[PDB]
């Protein structure tokens with residue numbers, strides 16, 4: 011197996027290297043935590059790391075890999091933010107002991123061949139206009155899970171549909187990992203942290219507060235019912251300059267084929283210029 | 299918190315995925331090497347060859363799963379009696395509901411090989427197989443998993459599954475058990491009437507003739523196989539293909555595999571063989 015220096019940041023690119031180190035660590039009683047990311051790390055990612063660090067006897071593995079298979083033609087893959095130096099600097103500051111930074115060739119030596127086919131949820135919301143997006147996400151997450159074999163894996167709640175689908179992956183394939191969702195870290199005004207907030211100009215940044223404002227307004231309006239919650243959120247979004255709403259939907263918490271009962275999730279996606287922002291919030295109807 | 303009961307040297311039967319997972323993990327922690335032999339019950343000498351192969355790994359515990367995948371005949375007490383006779387210590391016998399508690403949802407999509415050969419008549423067959431095999435591997439977490447070479451395309455797809463999803467299991471292909479005249483063992487053989495059973499030997503006879511003709515080249519090999527199949531009545535050949543060992547195009551020289559499938563009455567039979575072209 012390769013070298014592992016505790017208390018320091020060990021960076022591996024070969025899947026076999028991280029697999030060997032992970033398995034060796036687990037066999038000595040350390041529990042392995044995975045935080046899989048596409049890099050361009052921000053305090054929200056750091057919240058995931060800190061959650062992982064809190065598990066007694068944990069060793070934390072952070073993966074950074076911009077996965078080509080969840081993008082389609084149109085420039086999105088090339089445009090994805092890449093800040094490798096800041097990423098690794100942040101991991102050192104947080105006391106992370108393992109970064110896993112695979113090459114595209116190491117992950118996809120045979121190109122696209124066997125893949126994960128998600129359930130019907132993948133064709134809705136974010137997946138509506140992007141039919142293969144979630145198949146790309148679930149395929150890479152499955153791979154990272156098999157390479158690293160963590161005890162627990164950590165995701166932010168901002169991409170809530172992705173998190174739900176990942177829970178479906180884990181249940182449906184009987185994966186022996188616990189999925190931990192971490193509540194969304196926010197800027198002071200309430201804006202959900204995102205690696206894509208950097209693409210908001212000052213005017214768009216100002217207007218972007220409307221998403222979180224709309225969601226929180228709805229969460230409080232919800233004592234008066236679903237229609238009131240939805241209309242409160244719509245009013246706020248409508249009052250906001252240059253916010254073009256793509257959807258605003260209130261669903262059951264698992265987003266699945268069942269109606270809303272008392273507990274729901276309200277999800278929003280909107281464009282500000284060319285920048286697509288997402289946010290979501292827990293909703294209790296009538297209310298709790 | 300307690301591990302389900304496991305009595306070493308006896309046949310331990312578990313229908314709950316969580317139970318087999320817990321026992322396999324406990325065994326793994328005590329040093330035993332976990333071997334998995336997936337089956338659909340109605341065990342025959344082929345399945346016993348897989349068991350025996352698994353058994354000879356030192357420190358092995360053998361898990362035989364018995365599950366009829368609706369996504370891709372049963373003798374419950376006889377199957378278990380057979381496994382007991384082979385010294386198998388774990389049988390995993392889940393229900394459809396236990397394997398699919400949330401119904402059909404996330405599944406495995408095979409690569410384009412699944413559309414070829416057997417994927418012609420059954421375009422979704424291999425997605426079913428790969429899905430259940432993945433689940434079985436995740437429930438049991440064996441060090442090694444054993445499959446017959448009879449369903450060679452299936453075997454190749456499994457190796458692709460393991461490679462593509464970075465699974466930490468060793469895939470072991472076990473040579474096809476055959477009847478005395480060479481007919482590959484299969485649950486379907488008993489349906490053949492005497493004329494069909496006699497005609498069915500043409501599959502293995504064709505492939506072995508090809509394997510030996512191969513010193514004279516690829517074309518001689520294929521022509522020899524075709525001639526033998528052409529000598530049999532009521533054998534409707536669906537395909538006869540020479541491929542490389544991973545089922546891509548056959549290279550000009552080197553190792554390959556010759557695969558055949560044919561219908562005799564309503565029974566579809568398959569066979570395949572190693573071929574070397576120098």
Ligand SMILES: COc1ccc2c(c1)cc(C(=O)NS(=O)(=O)c1ccc(C)cn1)n2CC(=O)O
Pocket residue numbers: 079080122125126141142145146147149407
């Ligand atoms: C509803 O409109 C569409 C339009 C195009 C679509 C689909 C649906 C579904 C596929 C598809 O499953 N392609 S794939 O098997 O090659 C593949 C690609 C990428 C990843 C991650 C997983 N699997 N495709 C693309 C296609 O057919 O070529």
Ligand SMILES: COc1ccc2c(c1)cc(C(=O)NS(=O)(=O)c1ccc(C)cn1)n2CC(=O)O
Pocket residue numbers: 046047048049053054055057058165166167168169172192193194195202203204205206
């Ligand atoms: C706990 O506070 C938060 C708050 C916001 C967060 C996170 C944590 C983590 C992400 C994030 O992105 N993670 S990811 O690198 O695995 C990824 C990348 C791309 C796509 C499609 C989905 N997921 N984010 C949101 C963000 O950057 O937009």
Ligand SMILES: COc1ccc2c(c1)cc(C(=O)NS(=O)(=O)c1ccc(C)cn1)n2CC(=O)O
Pocket residue numbers: 336337338339340342343344345347348445446447448449472473474475482483484485486
């Ligand atoms: C080492 O030599 C051999 C020789 C022949 C073999 C095997 C091994 C394994 C099988 C086999 O398929 N097992 S199965 O659990 O996938 C199955 C059983 C019954 C039905 C109906 C469908 N699927 N067979 C052939 C066979 O039974 O058809």
